Amino acid sequence: MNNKIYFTPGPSELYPTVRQHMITALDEKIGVISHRSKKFEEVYKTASDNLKTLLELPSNYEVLFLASATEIWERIIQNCVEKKSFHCVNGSFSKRFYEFAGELGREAYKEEAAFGKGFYPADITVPADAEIICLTHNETSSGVSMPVEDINTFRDKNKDALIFVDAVSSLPYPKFDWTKIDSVFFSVQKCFGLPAGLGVWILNDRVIEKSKALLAKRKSIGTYHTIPSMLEKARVNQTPETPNAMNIFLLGKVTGDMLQISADGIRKQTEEKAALINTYIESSKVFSFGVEDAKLRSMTTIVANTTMLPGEINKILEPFDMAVGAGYGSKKETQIRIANFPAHSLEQVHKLVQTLKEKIG
Amino acid sequence: MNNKIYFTPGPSELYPTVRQHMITALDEKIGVISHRSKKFEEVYKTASDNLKTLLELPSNYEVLFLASATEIWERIIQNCVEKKSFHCVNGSFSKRFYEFAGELGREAYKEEAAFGKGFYPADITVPADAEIICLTHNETSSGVSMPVEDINTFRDKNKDALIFVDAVSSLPYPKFDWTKIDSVFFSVQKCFGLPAGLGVWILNDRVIEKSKALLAKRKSIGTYHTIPSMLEKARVNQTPETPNAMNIFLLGKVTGDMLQISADGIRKQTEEKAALINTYIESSKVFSFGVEDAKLRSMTTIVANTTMLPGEINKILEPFDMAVGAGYGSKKETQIRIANFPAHSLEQVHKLVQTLKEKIG
């Protein structure tokens, strides 16, 4: 029995109801039913509808299921970019997405900020010939966010561009204005508290139409995971290929649970936990903020500079059945990353902070 | 509690140990651990090694994990075909794979047999400029197989071509001669008895080298799921993106179970069940063979023509806690499809046949 609580930024601690929901999945033989069955269609619709409700999506948006967020990066470029994209790059994830454009033979503009820093939109312009704008709400590697108010400044910079937001390590925390962007995506092993194995692509009419326009130009936009392919199946509560039904099932159940709290309720809970952690960092003799600009510090993946090795910190936390993440990549010995996801309770965070205060200081 | 036994050809009845293995997964927090952790590397290696052992793969082959078999169709063409492929097409799955080539801008040769029929290699030639040969060991839509002895005839028809075999609905039944082909693939929701959400691509040095050659020619071969990308990670017991750890875990456990029986043992078990079913079809007043040539009838997905509607058959079977598949597509009212996978026991098949004999005849 693994009793350790993981404050790691994805995969992470499973949403607390997942165990019982998985037992239900096994009992109901969710893993056995046909992906073409009425029962599967019901499972699909529950997850799709619950996301639309939780995220308050308008009628011009659709929800599509894929294998991973990384897959979604690829599909965005294949379906929606003929020649050029524009990317805000400030860390490892936003950088990799930018790199995909070139690997796929496209030309990408890059607006870059140093690792540990964010963006100041007043200073940013977007070339007119950029077809899409790729923003990262939460750069998980560095702990920097692009708040919704900043995201909202991009629409007028290039009115015709399709705006995509990576909220992989933050949704459902940000509350988007769906009229100012065109698409958001995530995968389920971060704030949704599921095992990895499912990506979710939320996209609007403008995105769909762009894919259809490229296909009409006799450009290949893919195969099974073209937007039209996925859309045709989504309209009958299905997927083109046999999907990860277990996760679609679990997602509908967890989102149901989330709806009982409400998205705003979860947001408040997220903020209360972040405040506990940040208050401790304000006076810690070991930890300091990994991101200088307080407005741009992530509420969901809190990155702290540390004078102590993360390995040493985790060794101290082990007897207390807790673990935090180490810094990303080359920061693995100089920062920690504390996941603050819905799966993490106030009491768990309280225990973490108290333990850190007492044993690390 | 869903107590019905599903003889459906994928998804299908879970391997009998899956329930307890899933409980272990939950207990060990397999869904929580990092995909970059030593523990994950161990899980990965167990699944990879067990497949190499079970399938008796030689040293020039590697095992790669993807999201689905359908994804693998796409990746084969992207990574390995510059201009032209060759496909044997005799049903819905083999047809769709063939269609992907054109959707991706390639030109595909098609060797076609009617639905319900198979191939006679003596009569088949492969153009020299075909870069790959795509064979389907088990055409799940029609219940027709291409036995290994027939598969083996292709190597000399085009020595330089890469030979790919779709064994999605049959592995581990066929026993391939790995020197006469270059790659095989499957997904886990058929004979491996897992919930859907994992594809497996087994490929050799020749396949790997072709991908590297195309990339060198300055052709895009993809992004996260290029062969080199996947290979680099496979060599450290990882994947490029966050994968379906639950299924990688379950796959290693089930393959462990399978190894205790042995692949040849499972083959004998498969044959014994098929014989029970086929003996009944020989004298049934309702069922007849969906495939005329006995040599080409599938041992894993048995297709029978039926004078009774599958819906009526299943209504009769319902009180007995069993179900069979209906015919594929336009055959949904005139054929049934009986899955005979490792998950189905001799006693279960015996119960099915006895019930059919007694109630249908």
Side-chain angles (χ1 to χ4, degrees), chain A residues 2 4 13 19 27-29 71 74-75 103 196 220 223-224 243, chain B residues 2 4 13 19 27-29 71 74-75 103 196 220 223-224 243:
Chain A
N2 186 346
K4 188 195 277 166
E13 196 64 26
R19 183 181 188 98
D27 283 346
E28 296 187 3
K29 293 191 169 184
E71 180 182 0
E74 185 183 82
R75 304 315 182 183
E103 288 168 19
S220 172
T223 63
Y224 72 113
Chain B
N2 186 347
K4 188 195 277 166
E13 196 64 26
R19 183 181 188 98
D27 283 346
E28 296 187 3
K29 293 191 169 184
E71 180 182 0
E74 185 183 82
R75 304 315 182 183
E103 288 168 19
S220 172
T223 63
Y224 72 113

PDB file of all heavy atoms in Angstrom, chain A residues 2 4 13 19 27-29 71 74-75 103 196 220 223-224 243, chain B residues 2 4 13 19 27-29 71 74-75 103 196 220 223-224 243:
ATOM      1  N   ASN A   2       0.816   1.998  -1.071  1.00  0.00           N
ATOM      2  CA  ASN A   2       1.586   3.252  -1.189  1.00  0.00           C
ATOM      3  C   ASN A   2       0.762   4.347  -0.547  1.00  0.00           C
ATOM      4  O   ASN A   2      -0.294   4.729  -1.058  1.00  0.00           O
ATOM      5  CB  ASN A   2       1.854   3.542  -2.657  1.00  0.00           C
ATOM      6  CG  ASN A   2       2.768   4.740  -2.882  1.00  0.00           C
ATOM      7  OD1 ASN A   2       3.040   5.545  -1.982  1.00  0.00           O
ATOM      8  ND2 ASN A   2       3.245   4.857  -4.103  1.00  0.00           N
ATOM      9  N   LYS A   4       2.000   7.415   0.382  1.00  0.00           N
ATOM     10  CA  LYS A   4       2.612   8.704   0.159  1.00  0.00           C
ATOM     11  C   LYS A   4       1.693   9.619  -0.661  1.00  0.00           C
ATOM     12  O   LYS A   4       1.065   9.183  -1.637  1.00  0.00           O
ATOM     13  CB  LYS A   4       3.940   8.513  -0.565  1.00  0.00           C
ATOM     14  CG  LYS A   4       4.763   9.747  -0.677  1.00  0.00           C
ATOM     15  CD  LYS A   4       5.863   9.561  -1.690  1.00  0.00           C
ATOM     16  CE  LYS A   4       7.049   8.878  -1.110  1.00  0.00           C
ATOM     17  NZ  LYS A   4       7.939   8.422  -2.215  1.00  0.00           N
ATOM     18  N   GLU A  13      -1.337  13.155  -7.520  1.00  0.00           N
ATOM     19  CA  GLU A  13      -2.293  12.490  -6.659  1.00  0.00           C
ATOM     20  C   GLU A  13      -3.654  12.374  -7.397  1.00  0.00           C
ATOM     21  O   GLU A  13      -4.150  13.338  -7.976  1.00  0.00           O
ATOM     22  CB  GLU A  13      -2.422  13.271  -5.345  1.00  0.00           C
ATOM     23  CG  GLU A  13      -3.059  12.563  -4.200  1.00  0.00           C
ATOM     24  CD  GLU A  13      -2.294  11.343  -3.693  1.00  0.00           C
ATOM     25  OE1 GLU A  13      -1.046  11.212  -3.833  1.00  0.00           O
ATOM     26  OE2 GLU A  13      -2.990  10.509  -3.113  1.00  0.00           O
ATOM     27  N   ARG A  19     -10.647   6.109  -6.862  1.00  0.00           N
ATOM     28  CA  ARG A  19     -10.616   4.673  -6.487  1.00  0.00           C
ATOM     29  C   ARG A  19     -11.996   4.044  -6.565  1.00  0.00           C
ATOM     30  O   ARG A  19     -12.180   2.979  -7.179  1.00  0.00           O
ATOM     31  CB  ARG A  19     -10.007   4.466  -5.096  1.00  0.00           C
ATOM     32  CG  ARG A  19      -9.899   3.013  -4.711  1.00  0.00           C
ATOM     33  CD  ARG A  19      -9.307   2.806  -3.317  1.00  0.00           C
ATOM     34  NE  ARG A  19      -9.091   1.368  -3.164  1.00  0.00           N
ATOM     35  CZ  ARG A  19      -7.923   0.754  -3.348  1.00  0.00           C
ATOM     36  NH1 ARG A  19      -6.819   1.465  -3.587  1.00  0.00           N
ATOM     37  NH2 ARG A  19      -7.869  -0.570  -3.226  1.00  0.00           N
ATOM     38  N   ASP A  27     -16.724  -3.074 -12.200  1.00  0.00           N
ATOM     39  CA  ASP A  27     -18.001  -3.750 -11.931  1.00  0.00           C
ATOM     40  C   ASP A  27     -18.952  -3.709 -13.100  1.00  0.00           C
ATOM     41  O   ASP A  27     -19.663  -4.706 -13.388  1.00  0.00           O
ATOM     42  CB  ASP A  27     -18.719  -3.143 -10.715  1.00  0.00           C
ATOM     43  CG  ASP A  27     -18.130  -3.594  -9.398  1.00  0.00           C
ATOM     44  OD1 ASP A  27     -17.362  -4.558  -9.396  1.00  0.00           O
ATOM     45  OD2 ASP A  27     -18.478  -3.009  -8.355  1.00  0.00           O
ATOM     46  N   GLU A  28     -18.955  -2.565 -13.777  1.00  0.00           N
ATOM     47  CA  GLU A  28     -19.853  -2.331 -14.925  1.00  0.00           C
ATOM     48  C   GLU A  28     -19.287  -2.807 -16.247  1.00  0.00           C
ATOM     49  O   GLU A  28     -19.954  -2.725 -17.276  1.00  0.00           O
ATOM     50  CB  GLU A  28     -20.223  -0.865 -15.073  1.00  0.00           C
ATOM     51  CG  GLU A  28     -21.032  -0.358 -13.843  1.00  0.00           C
ATOM     52  CD  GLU A  28     -21.581   1.056 -13.982  1.00  0.00           C
ATOM     53  OE1 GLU A  28     -21.420   1.699 -15.033  1.00  0.00           O
ATOM     54  OE2 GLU A  28     -22.201   1.532 -13.001  1.00  0.00           O
ATOM     55  N   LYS A  29     -18.055  -3.292 -16.198  1.00  0.00           N
ATOM     56  CA  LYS A  29     -17.348  -3.762 -17.399  1.00  0.00           C
ATOM     57  C   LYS A  29     -17.195  -2.681 -18.475  1.00  0.00           C
ATOM     58  O   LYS A  29     -17.287  -2.930 -19.666  1.00  0.00           O
ATOM     59  CB  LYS A  29     -17.988  -5.051 -17.970  1.00  0.00           C
ATOM     60  CG  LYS A  29     -17.799  -6.220 -17.008  1.00  0.00           C
ATOM     61  CD  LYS A  29     -18.169  -7.544 -17.669  1.00  0.00           C
ATOM     62  CE  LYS A  29     -17.736  -8.740 -16.810  1.00  0.00           C
ATOM     63  NZ  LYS A  29     -17.993 -10.056 -17.459  1.00  0.00           N
ATOM     64  N   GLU A  71      -0.077  15.087 -28.312  1.00  0.00           N
ATOM     65  CA  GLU A  71      -0.743  14.772 -29.563  1.00  0.00           C
ATOM     66  C   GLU A  71      -1.485  16.017 -30.089  1.00  0.00           C
ATOM     67  O   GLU A  71      -1.425  16.337 -31.278  1.00  0.00           O
ATOM     68  CB  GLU A  71      -1.753  13.631 -29.437  1.00  0.00           C
ATOM     69  CG  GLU A  71      -2.376  13.380 -30.785  1.00  0.00           C
ATOM     70  CD  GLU A  71      -3.461  12.320 -30.903  1.00  0.00           C
ATOM     71  OE1 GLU A  71      -3.829  11.668 -29.911  1.00  0.00           O
ATOM     72  OE2 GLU A  71      -3.948  12.156 -32.064  1.00  0.00           O
ATOM     73  N   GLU A  74       0.589  18.560 -31.921  1.00  0.00           N
ATOM     74  CA  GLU A  74       0.795  18.116 -33.309  1.00  0.00           C
ATOM     75  C   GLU A  74      -0.432  18.349 -34.184  1.00  0.00           C
ATOM     76  O   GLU A  74      -0.326  18.874 -35.312  1.00  0.00           O
ATOM     77  CB  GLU A  74       1.225  16.646 -33.352  1.00  0.00           C
ATOM     78  CG  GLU A  74       1.566  16.165 -34.763  1.00  0.00           C
ATOM     79  CD  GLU A  74       1.922  14.696 -34.797  1.00  0.00           C
ATOM     80  OE1 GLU A  74       0.987  13.886 -34.823  1.00  0.00           O
ATOM     81  OE2 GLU A  74       3.109  14.398 -34.928  1.00  0.00           O
ATOM     82  N   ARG A  75      -1.601  17.969 -33.661  1.00  0.00           N
ATOM     83  CA  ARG A  75      -2.858  18.075 -34.410  1.00  0.00           C
ATOM     84  C   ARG A  75      -3.245  19.520 -34.670  1.00  0.00           C
ATOM     85  O   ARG A  75      -3.863  19.840 -35.708  1.00  0.00           O
ATOM     86  CB  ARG A  75      -4.017  17.330 -33.738  1.00  0.00           C
ATOM     87  CG  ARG A  75      -3.784  15.860 -33.452  1.00  0.00           C
ATOM     88  CD  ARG A  75      -3.157  15.120 -34.600  1.00  0.00           C
ATOM     89  NE  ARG A  75      -3.009  13.678 -34.281  1.00  0.00           N
ATOM     90  CZ  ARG A  75      -2.428  12.805 -35.092  1.00  0.00           C
ATOM     91  NH1 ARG A  75      -1.896  13.230 -36.236  1.00  0.00           N
ATOM     92  NH2 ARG A  75      -2.404  11.515 -34.764  1.00  0.00           N
ATOM     93  N   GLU A 103       9.351  21.189 -36.982  1.00  0.00           N
ATOM     94  CA  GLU A 103       9.496  19.759 -37.307  1.00  0.00           C
ATOM     95  C   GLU A 103       8.476  19.313 -38.354  1.00  0.00           C
ATOM     96  O   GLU A 103       8.702  18.341 -39.109  1.00  0.00           O
ATOM     97  CB  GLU A 103       9.390  18.899 -36.044  1.00  0.00           C
ATOM     98  CG  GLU A 103      10.605  19.068 -35.208  1.00  0.00           C
ATOM     99  CD  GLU A 103      10.503  18.505 -33.795  1.00  0.00           C
ATOM    100  OE1 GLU A 103       9.637  17.673 -33.533  1.00  0.00           O
ATOM    101  OE2 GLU A 103      11.301  18.951 -32.933  1.00  0.00           O
ATOM    102  N   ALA A 196      -2.746   9.221 -16.365  1.00  0.00           N
ATOM    103  CA  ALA A 196      -2.506   9.690 -17.733  1.00  0.00           C
ATOM    104  C   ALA A 196      -3.123   8.682 -18.738  1.00  0.00           C
ATOM    105  O   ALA A 196      -3.287   7.491 -18.450  1.00  0.00           O
ATOM    106  CB  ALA A 196      -0.997   9.916 -18.000  1.00  0.00           C
ATOM    107  N   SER A 220      -3.150  17.810 -47.046  1.00  0.00           N
ATOM    108  CA  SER A 220      -3.450  16.750 -46.072  1.00  0.00           C
ATOM    109  C   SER A 220      -3.423  17.380 -44.701  1.00  0.00           C
ATOM    110  O   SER A 220      -2.466  18.097 -44.365  1.00  0.00           O
ATOM    111  CB  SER A 220      -2.429  15.632 -46.097  1.00  0.00           C
ATOM    112  OG  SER A 220      -2.690  14.757 -45.015  1.00  0.00           O
ATOM    113  N   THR A 223      -5.247  12.014 -40.803  1.00  0.00           N
ATOM    114  CA  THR A 223      -6.016  10.792 -41.054  1.00  0.00           C
ATOM    115  C   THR A 223      -7.137  10.655 -40.030  1.00  0.00           C
ATOM    116  O   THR A 223      -8.174  11.310 -40.175  1.00  0.00           O
ATOM    117  CB  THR A 223      -5.142   9.514 -41.139  1.00  0.00           C
ATOM    118  OG1 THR A 223      -4.470   9.267 -39.897  1.00  0.00           O
ATOM    119  CG2 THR A 223      -4.135   9.580 -42.322  1.00  0.00           C
ATOM    120  N   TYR A 224      -6.927   9.807 -39.037  1.00  0.00           N
ATOM    121  CA  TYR A 224      -7.968   9.540 -38.024  1.00  0.00           C
ATOM    122  C   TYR A 224      -8.269  10.715 -37.135  1.00  0.00           C
ATOM    123  O   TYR A 224      -9.405  10.874 -36.647  1.00  0.00           O
ATOM    124  CB  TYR A 224      -7.649   8.254 -37.198  1.00  0.00           C
ATOM    125  CG  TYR A 224      -6.520   8.391 -36.227  1.00  0.00           C
ATOM    126  CD1 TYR A 224      -6.751   8.331 -34.878  1.00  0.00           C
ATOM    127  CD2 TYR A 224      -5.217   8.610 -36.657  1.00  0.00           C
ATOM    128  CE1 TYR A 224      -5.716   8.489 -33.950  1.00  0.00           C
ATOM    129  CE2 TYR A 224      -4.179   8.783 -35.755  1.00  0.00           C
ATOM    130  CZ  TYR A 224      -4.438   8.734 -34.397  1.00  0.00           C
ATOM    131  OH  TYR A 224      -3.423   8.926 -33.496  1.00  0.00           O
ATOM    132  N   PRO A 243     -11.110   4.308 -28.171  1.00  0.00           N
ATOM    133  CA  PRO A 243     -10.442   5.224 -27.264  1.00  0.00           C
ATOM    134  C   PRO A 243     -10.201   4.676 -25.876  1.00  0.00           C
ATOM    135  O   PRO A 243     -10.594   3.561 -25.566  1.00  0.00           O
ATOM    136  CB  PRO A 243     -11.473   6.315 -27.131  1.00  0.00           C
ATOM    137  CG  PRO A 243     -12.758   5.593 -27.129  1.00  0.00           C
ATOM    138  CD  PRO A 243     -12.588   4.428 -28.070  1.00  0.00           C
TER     139      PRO A 243
ATOM    140  N   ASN B   2     -22.154  -6.155 -13.630  1.00  0.00           N
ATOM    141  CA  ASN B   2     -22.376  -6.670 -14.996  1.00  0.00           C
ATOM    142  C   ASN B   2     -21.766  -8.054 -15.058  1.00  0.00           C
ATOM    143  O   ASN B   2     -20.544  -8.212 -14.996  1.00  0.00           O
ATOM    144  CB  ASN B   2     -21.730  -5.728 -15.999  1.00  0.00           C
ATOM    145  CG  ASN B   2     -22.024  -6.093 -17.449  1.00  0.00           C
ATOM    146  OD1 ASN B   2     -22.509  -7.185 -17.774  1.00  0.00           O
ATOM    147  ND2 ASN B   2     -21.723  -5.163 -18.331  1.00  0.00           N
ATOM    148  N   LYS B   4     -22.439 -10.362 -17.514  1.00  0.00           N
ATOM    149  CA  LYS B   4     -22.469 -10.866 -18.867  1.00  0.00           C
ATOM    150  C   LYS B   4     -21.050 -11.108 -19.398  1.00  0.00           C
ATOM    151  O   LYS B   4     -20.141 -10.293 -19.182  1.00  0.00           O
ATOM    152  CB  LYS B   4     -23.199  -9.869 -19.760  1.00  0.00           C
ATOM    153  CG  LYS B   4     -23.471 -10.361 -21.137  1.00  0.00           C
ATOM    154  CD  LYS B   4     -23.861  -9.221 -22.041  1.00  0.00           C
ATOM    155  CE  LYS B   4     -25.305  -8.884 -21.925  1.00  0.00           C
ATOM    156  NZ  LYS B   4     -25.550  -7.560 -22.563  1.00  0.00           N
ATOM    157  N   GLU B  13     -14.013  -9.250 -23.369  1.00  0.00           N
ATOM    158  CA  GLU B  13     -13.883  -9.697 -21.998  1.00  0.00           C
ATOM    159  C   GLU B  13     -12.428  -9.454 -21.515  1.00  0.00           C
ATOM    160  O   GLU B  13     -11.464  -9.788 -22.200  1.00  0.00           O
ATOM    161  CB  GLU B  13     -14.274 -11.177 -21.906  1.00  0.00           C
ATOM    162  CG  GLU B  13     -14.563 -11.716 -20.548  1.00  0.00           C
ATOM    163  CD  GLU B  13     -15.772 -11.095 -19.854  1.00  0.00           C
ATOM    164  OE1 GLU B  13     -16.733 -10.578 -20.489  1.00  0.00           O
ATOM    165  OE2 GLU B  13     -15.746 -11.162 -18.625  1.00  0.00           O
ATOM    166  N   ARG B  19      -8.770  -7.678 -13.036  1.00  0.00           N
ATOM    167  CA  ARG B  19      -9.377  -7.018 -11.852  1.00  0.00           C
ATOM    168  C   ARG B  19      -8.395  -6.926 -10.698  1.00  0.00           C
ATOM    169  O   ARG B  19      -8.203  -5.849 -10.106  1.00  0.00           O
ATOM    170  CB  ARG B  19     -10.664  -7.723 -11.412  1.00  0.00           C
ATOM    171  CG  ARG B  19     -11.343  -7.040 -10.253  1.00  0.00           C
ATOM    172  CD  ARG B  19     -12.617  -7.752  -9.801  1.00  0.00           C
ATOM    173  NE  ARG B  19     -13.255  -6.881  -8.814  1.00  0.00           N
ATOM    174  CZ  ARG B  19     -14.257  -6.044  -9.078  1.00  0.00           C
ATOM    175  NH1 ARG B  19     -14.826  -6.034 -10.285  1.00  0.00           N
ATOM    176  NH2 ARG B  19     -14.718  -5.268  -8.100  1.00  0.00           N
ATOM    177  N   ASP B  27      -3.485   0.438  -5.556  1.00  0.00           N
ATOM    178  CA  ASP B  27      -2.784   0.339  -4.268  1.00  0.00           C
ATOM    179  C   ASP B  27      -1.385   0.900  -4.308  1.00  0.00           C
ATOM    180  O   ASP B  27      -0.926   1.558  -3.339  1.00  0.00           O
ATOM    181  CB  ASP B  27      -2.695  -1.116  -3.780  1.00  0.00           C
ATOM    182  CG  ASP B  27      -3.992  -1.617  -3.186  1.00  0.00           C
ATOM    183  OD1 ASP B  27      -4.866  -0.796  -2.902  1.00  0.00           O
ATOM    184  OD2 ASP B  27      -4.114  -2.836  -2.957  1.00  0.00           O
ATOM    185  N   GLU B  28      -0.717   0.652  -5.430  1.00  0.00           N
ATOM    186  CA  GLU B  28       0.679   1.089  -5.629  1.00  0.00           C
ATOM    187  C   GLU B  28       0.805   2.496  -6.176  1.00  0.00           C
ATOM    188  O   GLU B  28       1.911   3.005  -6.335  1.00  0.00           O
ATOM    189  CB  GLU B  28       1.445   0.156  -6.551  1.00  0.00           C
ATOM    190  CG  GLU B  28       1.572  -1.270  -5.937  1.00  0.00           C
ATOM    191  CD  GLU B  28       2.463  -2.223  -6.723  1.00  0.00           C
ATOM    192  OE1 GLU B  28       3.067  -1.837  -7.738  1.00  0.00           O
ATOM    193  OE2 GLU B  28       2.563  -3.399  -6.298  1.00  0.00           O
ATOM    194  N   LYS B  29      -0.339   3.099  -6.464  1.00  0.00           N
ATOM    195  CA  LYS B  29      -0.390   4.453  -7.037  1.00  0.00           C
ATOM    196  C   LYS B  29       0.350   4.574  -8.374  1.00  0.00           C
ATOM    197  O   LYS B  29       0.993   5.565  -8.674  1.00  0.00           O
ATOM    198  CB  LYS B  29       0.086   5.521  -6.022  1.00  0.00           C
ATOM    199  CG  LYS B  29      -0.891   5.630  -4.854  1.00  0.00           C
ATOM    200  CD  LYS B  29      -0.593   6.856  -3.998  1.00  0.00           C
ATOM    201  CE  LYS B  29      -1.718   7.121  -2.988  1.00  0.00           C
ATOM    202  NZ  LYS B  29      -1.515   8.364  -2.191  1.00  0.00           N
ATOM    203  N   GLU B  71      -3.404   4.799 -34.667  1.00  0.00           N
ATOM    204  CA  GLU B  71      -2.285   5.724 -34.640  1.00  0.00           C
ATOM    205  C   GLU B  71      -1.077   5.106 -35.373  1.00  0.00           C
ATOM    206  O   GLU B  71      -0.404   5.771 -36.164  1.00  0.00           O
ATOM    207  CB  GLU B  71      -1.844   6.097 -33.225  1.00  0.00           C
ATOM    208  CG  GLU B  71      -0.691   7.062 -33.310  1.00  0.00           C
ATOM    209  CD  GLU B  71      -0.039   7.538 -32.021  1.00  0.00           C
ATOM    210  OE1 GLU B  71      -0.448   7.145 -30.915  1.00  0.00           O
ATOM    211  OE2 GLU B  71       0.928   8.349 -32.158  1.00  0.00           O
ATOM    212  N   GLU B  74      -1.085   5.342 -39.124  1.00  0.00           N
ATOM    213  CA  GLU B  74      -0.627   6.681 -39.531  1.00  0.00           C
ATOM    214  C   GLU B  74       0.886   6.834 -39.432  1.00  0.00           C
ATOM    215  O   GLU B  74       1.544   7.337 -40.367  1.00  0.00           O
ATOM    216  CB  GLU B  74      -1.340   7.769 -38.723  1.00  0.00           C
ATOM    217  CG  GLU B  74      -0.989   9.184 -39.186  1.00  0.00           C
ATOM    218  CD  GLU B  74      -1.646  10.246 -38.334  1.00  0.00           C
ATOM    219  OE1 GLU B  74      -1.098  10.536 -37.264  1.00  0.00           O
ATOM    220  OE2 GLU B  74      -2.608  10.848 -38.813  1.00  0.00           O
ATOM    221  N   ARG B  75       1.444   6.390 -38.302  1.00  0.00           N
ATOM    222  CA  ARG B  75       2.881   6.527 -38.039  1.00  0.00           C
ATOM    223  C   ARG B  75       3.715   5.684 -38.987  1.00  0.00           C
ATOM    224  O   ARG B  75       4.850   6.061 -39.348  1.00  0.00           O
ATOM    225  CB  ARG B  75       3.254   6.214 -36.586  1.00  0.00           C
ATOM    226  CG  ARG B  75       2.523   7.014 -35.526  1.00  0.00           C
ATOM    227  CD  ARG B  75       2.436   8.482 -35.839  1.00  0.00           C
ATOM    228  NE  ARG B  75       1.764   9.216 -34.739  1.00  0.00           N
ATOM    229  CZ  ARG B  75       1.498  10.514 -34.782  1.00  0.00           C
ATOM    230  NH1 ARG B  75       1.796  11.206 -35.880  1.00  0.00           N
ATOM    231  NH2 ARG B  75       0.961  11.113 -33.721  1.00  0.00           N
ATOM    232  N   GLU B 103      -4.713   9.627 -47.944  1.00  0.00           N
ATOM    233  CA  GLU B 103      -5.036  10.816 -47.137  1.00  0.00           C
ATOM    234  C   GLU B 103      -3.777  11.584 -46.736  1.00  0.00           C
ATOM    235  O   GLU B 103      -3.813  12.812 -46.494  1.00  0.00           O
ATOM    236  CB  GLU B 103      -5.854  10.432 -45.901  1.00  0.00           C
ATOM    237  CG  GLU B 103      -7.231  10.046 -46.300  1.00  0.00           C
ATOM    238  CD  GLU B 103      -8.054   9.364 -45.214  1.00  0.00           C
ATOM    239  OE1 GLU B 103      -7.720   9.479 -44.036  1.00  0.00           O
ATOM    240  OE2 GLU B 103      -9.035   8.670 -45.578  1.00  0.00           O
ATOM    241  N   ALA B 196      -9.204  -0.738 -23.716  1.00  0.00           N
ATOM    242  CA  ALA B 196      -8.541   0.008 -24.789  1.00  0.00           C
ATOM    243  C   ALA B 196      -7.778   1.213 -24.180  1.00  0.00           C
ATOM    244  O   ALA B 196      -8.116   1.727 -23.109  1.00  0.00           O
ATOM    245  CB  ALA B 196      -9.550   0.457 -25.877  1.00  0.00           C
ATOM    246  N   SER B 220       9.795  15.707 -43.306  1.00  0.00           N
ATOM    247  CA  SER B 220       9.233  15.607 -41.950  1.00  0.00           C
ATOM    248  C   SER B 220       8.646  14.224 -41.809  1.00  0.00           C
ATOM    249  O   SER B 220       7.891  13.777 -42.687  1.00  0.00           O
ATOM    250  CB  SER B 220       8.131  16.615 -41.703  1.00  0.00           C
ATOM    251  OG  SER B 220       7.529  16.329 -40.454  1.00  0.00           O
ATOM    252  N   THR B 223       6.600  14.380 -35.244  1.00  0.00           N
ATOM    253  CA  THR B 223       7.026  15.140 -34.066  1.00  0.00           C
ATOM    254  C   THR B 223       7.342  14.193 -32.913  1.00  0.00           C
ATOM    255  O   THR B 223       8.426  13.601 -32.895  1.00  0.00           O
ATOM    256  CB  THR B 223       6.031  16.254 -33.651  1.00  0.00           C
ATOM    257  OG1 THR B 223       4.763  15.698 -33.281  1.00  0.00           O
ATOM    258  CG2 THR B 223       5.872  17.330 -34.762  1.00  0.00           C
ATOM    259  N   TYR B 224       6.418  14.079 -31.974  1.00  0.00           N
ATOM    260  CA  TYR B 224       6.641  13.245 -30.777  1.00  0.00           C
ATOM    261  C   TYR B 224       6.720  11.771 -31.066  1.00  0.00           C
ATOM    262  O   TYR B 224       7.414  11.017 -30.356  1.00  0.00           O
ATOM    263  CB  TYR B 224       5.602  13.561 -29.655  1.00  0.00           C
ATOM    264  CG  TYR B 224       4.213  13.075 -29.925  1.00  0.00           C
ATOM    265  CD1 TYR B 224       3.662  12.082 -29.159  1.00  0.00           C
ATOM    266  CD2 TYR B 224       3.456  13.591 -30.970  1.00  0.00           C
ATOM    267  CE1 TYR B 224       2.378  11.589 -29.414  1.00  0.00           C
ATOM    268  CE2 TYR B 224       2.187  13.107 -31.248  1.00  0.00           C
ATOM    269  CZ  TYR B 224       1.656  12.093 -30.471  1.00  0.00           C
ATOM    270  OH  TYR B 224       0.412  11.592 -30.751  1.00  0.00           O
ATOM    271  N   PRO B 243       2.507   8.681 -20.958  1.00  0.00           N
ATOM    272  CA  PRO B 243       1.730   7.618 -21.571  1.00  0.00           C
ATOM    273  C   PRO B 243       0.649   7.036 -20.689  1.00  0.00           C
ATOM    274  O   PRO B 243       0.503   7.423 -19.540  1.00  0.00           O
ATOM    275  CB  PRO B 243       2.777   6.548 -21.745  1.00  0.00           C
ATOM    276  CG  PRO B 243       3.614   6.668 -20.539  1.00  0.00           C
ATOM    277  CD  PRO B 243       3.671   8.138 -20.210  1.00  0.00           C
TER     278      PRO B 243
END
